[PDB]
Nucleic acid binder design. Structure first.
Lengths: 73, 369, 82
RNA sequence: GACCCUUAAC
RNA sequence: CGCGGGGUGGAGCAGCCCGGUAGCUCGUCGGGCUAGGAACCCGAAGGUCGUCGGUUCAAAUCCGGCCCCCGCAACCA
RNA sequence: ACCCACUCGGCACCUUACGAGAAAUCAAAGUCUUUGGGUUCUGGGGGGAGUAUGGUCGCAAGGCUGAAACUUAAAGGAAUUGACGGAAGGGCACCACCAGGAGUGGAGCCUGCGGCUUAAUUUGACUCAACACGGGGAAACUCACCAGGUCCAGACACAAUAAGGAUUGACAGAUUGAGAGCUCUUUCUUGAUUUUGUGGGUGGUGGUGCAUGGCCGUUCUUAGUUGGUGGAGUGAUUUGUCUGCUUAAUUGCGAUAACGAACGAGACCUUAACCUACUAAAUAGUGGUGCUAGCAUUUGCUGGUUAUCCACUUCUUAGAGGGACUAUCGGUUUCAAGCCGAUGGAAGUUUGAGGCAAUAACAGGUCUGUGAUGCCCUUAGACGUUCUGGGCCGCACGCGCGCUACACUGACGGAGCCAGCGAGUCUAACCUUGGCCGAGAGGUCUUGGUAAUCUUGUGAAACUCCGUCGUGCUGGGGAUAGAGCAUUGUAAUUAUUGCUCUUCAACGAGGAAUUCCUAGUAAGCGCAAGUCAUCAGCUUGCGUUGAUUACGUCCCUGCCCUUUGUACACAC
């Protein structure tokens, strides 16, 4: 037995419990009218028609596309 | 190696045979025994969290050593090294005889011979009438010459930088040749006032050095017994003055230490005040605290008030370790103290074991709640 | 440091290997009176080179003065006809 | 002819 | 405070019928013996000879200084 | 003076004998718990200690008398069994010697061990009975050791944010090589393992082989071990199991308080090789097919389409009466089992060799083979599970097992060519056969046998006509460097391995010491297999060429048996 100092920082990082935030899915307030779909997806037939195009700022994120998503307007 | 080859237990056998071999090779690394000796240790130290290594520690002591030791045991034996570390007082021995003089130094254990010389004495017999007294006074004058030469040689080997380093001077000899040396005027005033005792030895030279140590074994220890009473004596005399510089309790006397003054700080050999280094993670705040000997083994206060978070036990450092980092700021002498003496016994049992002298009479209770 | 050697002396052998007229006609006049003639016999008596001994032996059998009896390699056994 | 010794270490 | 010797490996001795640029023993180290110690066997290392200055025929032995080990004389009024 | 028979007295003399004794043993040491003939002296656990404060005798040396303190759990007697003996008598063994042989130790190198690098050099094994052993070459895993985000399979309480949706798969960012973001100013297609005080866990080449199983290592590499019944002794035990006779044998012959048995030895099992008849295919010479390459028109020396075969089997192939049992004989021994010689037969001290191989034992080794097994501040940051990079693949040194040499009986160049074990193919490219020009290596193609006809009629190293240097640190030199060429390997830089080129490096019958060896053995030589991703200086098997004594001894270190001494008892 010589020593054990644990130079790497204190990394007891057990997973969180998913602390609840406020209610979500604020699509719109559309009473007595046509109900459309949000996050319109690509023309590729392999899209599951249930995923969300996370397009924040000129960058598009799609769950169905594993690593590549490139389209031109 | 052979006697260890028939240890019944394999775990003991292999360890001892390997330990002996590793000692052998490190001794093979040394061509000769260095001065101050060579202290060797082999084994397997035990820390926490399981990362094994076999250690091999040989070093030359900073101070000369006299003890010899070889012990194979389930634990390391450092008691000789601790004693050689604690005992630092040096006592000079002067062995004066008509045949010659010797000067020696005595640490806690080791015995060194600084400088010894022989002298041809004249003939006591004068067997004259019209010149007996002239030769008798002449013979006395040569004795004075030898007394002074021994006296001046004492200053050269013991006094260094206009300060005496040896704790005390033991003047050993026979046939009244040490009484005159101690009472001689040419003998240094500081060294004469440091004369410990006169010892009647049956032999001169190195043999008288051995016998002088044997007859002065208890007195050398009693020197620290004497300086111990003197250190606290000025502390208690200032108490008997009924003056305003009275303090008690570690909680207060440490505040006095942090304020200033404190000519001398008194620290016990076996401190009862164990302190834990604390460090909070959240607020990023660092502070200093103090603890009591009796309210730390079992108390329901061991929780977090500032943040209310659990704290794992941290390795604890002594107060002497922290105070030794900056013990020179106050200039106070680090003196290990005892509790044997009755006056000291009530000081420990009534006054907290820490005291100091203030430069002037200043009020503490004036600013209090 | 010790190297555990003996390092004996040497005789400084001087086996000549390119032969001149003095050696050429010496061996020619001395190949008689030699009951047994071989490669080692030539070099240990006329102090010629090892290759000269076998080459000269081939010369003495080409013209023919010394009559070989055993033509084995590593050991040449030639006698002289009488 | 010569031939001494043998663990504290479960 | 005179007169004499001596100083060569860790230790003891070889250059004293004026010169082998230093050798022989113990000790130490390595190997082998033996089931390890010892004893034994086989090998190896170790000092430019107290220091400084003088003839320059391998000179430092033998010369002159200081230090060290010692030894004898230290009397008659 | 002898001989017989008495007798008294004496020195003695033959027994685990009625009796006595703890036994040894005892003609008294008996007549003694069935205790008494007379009488003197002495002892009461060991030591201190026959040690005087004393006394007495003595010239003295010393004699006689003679404690205590204190300290001990034993000391001691006689046997038994074993172990041991620089004790004796026998018998043995080349892990012993003798006559020797080849050597090792000496050189370089390859392996395996023994401290240290405040970073690991994983580890067990310390005489035989470890140290080319762990079947232990490591591109990397194997792997344990080190540096490194660190993902985990609750069995029957649920102490609750359990639809306040308890939860996974993923962009990148100083820090994750990556179609391995675990949460992280941005959380998206199926979704009901819930998360930590905390009392059962499913793993670990973590430690304990002084907790164990099993397996393997000293003697049985050599003849030991043990019941039943009977005998002896109080008993531990002993006899059987033993004098002599021979033992590569507690093997037998045999005296015999033993008889009858069991285990071990032997016997048993495996090889070489003559049965020539229900052991062979053209998987081997074939006895006659068909003709070609030389001479004699007279009589050889080799190649062969593929289901006509013909009185087919003696060589590597191994069943059924087989065979070799000391034949017989010669001699030596109570002619008893049996040493030794003479023709004999594939072979003769049981034919050679090996396997199997008893009863106790060892704190022998192995927890690192095992999913064979209790403990380890163990069950969501770990020793578990892996992924990347490092490393017994590191050097002042010492030791063990080894390889190649120090050369003319030898090196090199031709050339001639000759064995035997044996292996080789599914989620197959292993066994390099020929037509890959290619040219050490391996990509093209695989025409290839339930592996004699394919590697391989093993077609090899060693060896052996003839020639190159001649005795030198020389052609005995890649030992050590540099430069380049190749294939196995998601990857070799601390040469993976093979190939071509430069220089001599130590080394010149190696000190003390030491090992193995009795026949086709030793020794020289090389090949297949294990390991293996090509290529291993090791092992296992083997096969080629083939040495001096074998009437041996115990002194040469150890075994076996017996007798004897012991104050030893895990036992010199």
């Amino acid at each position: 037995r010589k020593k054990k100092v644990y130079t790497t920082p204190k990394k007891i990082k057990h997973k969180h419990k998913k602390v609840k935030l406020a209610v979500l899915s604020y699509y719109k307030v559309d009473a007595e009218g046509k109900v459309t779909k949000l996050r319109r997806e690509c023309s590729n037939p392999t899209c599951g028609a249930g995923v969300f195009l996370a397009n924040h700022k000129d960058r598009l994120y799609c769950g169905k596309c594993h690593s590549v998503y490139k389209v031109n307007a | 190696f052979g006697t260890a080859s028939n240890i019944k237990s394999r775990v003991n056998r292999l360890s001892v045979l390997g330990a002996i071999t590793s000692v052998q090779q490190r001794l093979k690394l040394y061509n000769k025994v260095p001065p101050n000796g060579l202290v060797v240790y082999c084994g397997t130290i035990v820390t926490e969290e399981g990362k094994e290594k076999k250690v091999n520690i040989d070093f030359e002591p900073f101070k000369p050593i006299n003890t010899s030791l070889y012990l194979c045991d389930n634990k390391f034996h450092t008691e000789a090294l601790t004693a050689l570390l604690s005992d630092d007082s040096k006592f000079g021995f002067i062995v004066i005889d008509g045949s010659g003089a010797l000067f020696g130094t005595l640490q806690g254990n080791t015995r060194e011979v600084l400088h010894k010389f022989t002298v041809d004495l004249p003939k006591k017999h004068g067997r004259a009438a019209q010149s007996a007294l002239r030769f008798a006074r002449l013979r006395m004058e040569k004795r004075h010459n030898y007394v002074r030469k021994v006296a001046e040689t004492a200053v050269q080997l013991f006094i260094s930088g206009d300060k005496v380093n040896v704790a005390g001077l033991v003047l050993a000899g026979s046939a009244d040749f040490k009484t005159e040396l101690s009472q001689s005027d040419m003998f240094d005033q500081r060294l004469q006032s440091k004369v410990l005792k006169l010892v009647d030895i049956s032999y001169g030279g190195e043999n008288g050095f051995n016998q002088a140590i044997e007859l002065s074994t208890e007195v050398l220890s009693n020197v620290k017994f004497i300086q111990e009473k003197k250190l606290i004596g000025r502390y208690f005399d200032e108490i008997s003055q009924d003056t305003g510089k009275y303090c008690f309790g570690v909680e207060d006397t440490l505040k006095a230490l942090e304020m200033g003054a404190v000519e001398i700080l008194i620290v016990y050999e076996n401190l009862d005040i164990m302190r834990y280094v604390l460090h909070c993670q959240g607020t990023e705040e660092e502070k200093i605290l103090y603890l009591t000997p009796e309210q730390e083994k079992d108390k329901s206060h061991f929780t977090d008030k500032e943040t209310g978070q659990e704290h794992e036990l941290i390795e604890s450092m002594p107060l002497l370790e922290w105070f030794a980092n900056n013990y020179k700021k106050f200039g106070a002498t680090l003196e290990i103290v005892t509790d044997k003496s009755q006056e000291g016994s009530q000081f420990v049992k009534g006054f907290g074991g820490i005291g100091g002298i203030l430069r002037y009479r200043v009020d503490f209770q004036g600013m209090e709640y | 440091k010790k190297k555990w050697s003996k390092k004996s002396m040497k005789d400084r052998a001087q086996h000549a290997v390119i032969l001149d007229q003095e050696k050429y006609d010496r061996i020619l006049k001395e190949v008689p009176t030699y009951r047994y003639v071989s490669v080692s016999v030539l070099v240990d008596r006329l102090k010629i080179g090892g290759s000269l001994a076998r080459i000269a032996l081939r010369h003495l059998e080409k013209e023919g003065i010394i009559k070989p009896i055993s033509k084995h390699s590593k050991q040449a056994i030639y006698t002289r006809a009488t």
